[PDB]
Design a protein around this ligand. Sequence first.
Ligand SMILES: O=C(O)[C@H]1O[C@@H](O[C@H]2[C@H](O)[C@H](O)[C@H](O[C@H]3[C@H](O)[C@H](O)[C@H](O[C@H]4[C@H](O)[C@H](O)[C@H](O)O[C@@H]4C(=O)O)O[C@@H]3C(=O)O)O[C@@H]2C(=O)O)[C@@H](O)[C@@H](O)[C@@H]1O
Length: 227
Amino acid sequence: FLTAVSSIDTFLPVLNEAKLQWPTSALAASSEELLGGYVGSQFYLQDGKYMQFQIAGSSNRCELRQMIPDGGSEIGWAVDDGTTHTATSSIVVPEQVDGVEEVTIMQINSGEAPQLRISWIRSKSLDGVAYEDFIMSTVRIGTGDSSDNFVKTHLADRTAGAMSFQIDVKDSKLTITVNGNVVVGQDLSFWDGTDSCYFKAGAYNNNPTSESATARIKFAALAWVDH
Ligand SMILES: O=C(O)[C@H]1O[C@@H](O[C@H]2[C@H](O)[C@H](O)[C@H](O[C@H]3[C@H](O)[C@H](O)[C@H](O[C@H]4[C@H](O)[C@H](O)[C@H](O)O[C@@H]4C(=O)O)O[C@@H]3C(=O)O)O[C@@H]2C(=O)O)[C@@H](O)[C@@H](O)[C@@H]1O
C-alpha cells in the first residue's frame, strides 16, 4: 500500500499548479487528479514526507509540468516579461543504481528547447576538471547541438542530506542558489520573446546504459511562484 503525495499538506500548493507526465511527456494526469489522490510506484509519499519520483527507460520521465493554478491550463511565460519566475525545492538524491547516468530534476522548458536543466550526473569533465556524482546546470544559449550552444556548471556534489535549490528568472537573467549559496546573472536573452516557458521538476532519465535501471528522486519541498 502506497501513500498518496496529496495525503499531507506539504505539496498541495504545487500540485494545484502542476500536471504529472508519466512515463512520457504525452501521457499525463491533471492537477485535479493529483489533488484527488493520484498515487503509484512512480509517484508516492515516501517515509511520510518525500514526494518521490521513480522512472526507468531512456528519456522516460515522471515529472511535474507547471500549470496555471486552480484548474488552469498550461502556463507559458517569458524570461523578459518583467515578472520574476521562481522555483524552489529541497531534494534528497539517493544513490542512483547502475545504469542510471543522468537524471534531470528541475527544468525551465519551453515550446522551443530547454532553457535550463538541473541534473544529477554520474561523471563528467567540465572545463578541464573531472567531477563525479554531482549536480549540474545546463543552460541553452542557442538552438544548435554542439557544445557551444550550452553553458554547463558544476553546482554541488551530491549530498547525503536534503539539498535546497532556488531558480530565479528576471529580466532575461538567471540566478541559481544551492543550499543558500549562489552558484550561478546568466544571460537568457536569446530566449527574449519566447512566451512558452514553464517550470518542471521530478525525474527525467537521460542516456541510461540500462533500460531497466530505475532513477529515483525524493522532494521534501517544491514550489513555483510568480512575482
Ligand atoms: O557536453 C558534453 O561534453 C556532452 O554533451 C552531449 O550533448 C548533450 C547536450 O550538451 C545537452 O545536454 C543535451 O540535452 C538534451 C537532452 O539530451 C534531451 O534530448 C532533452 O530533451 C528535451 C526535449 O526538448 C523534449 O522536447 C522534452 O522536453 O524532453 C526534454 C526535456 O524535458 O528537457 O533536450 C536537451 C537539449 O536539447 O538541450 O543532450 C546532449 C546529449 O547527447 O546527451 C554530447 O555532445 C556529448 O558528446 C558531449 O560529450
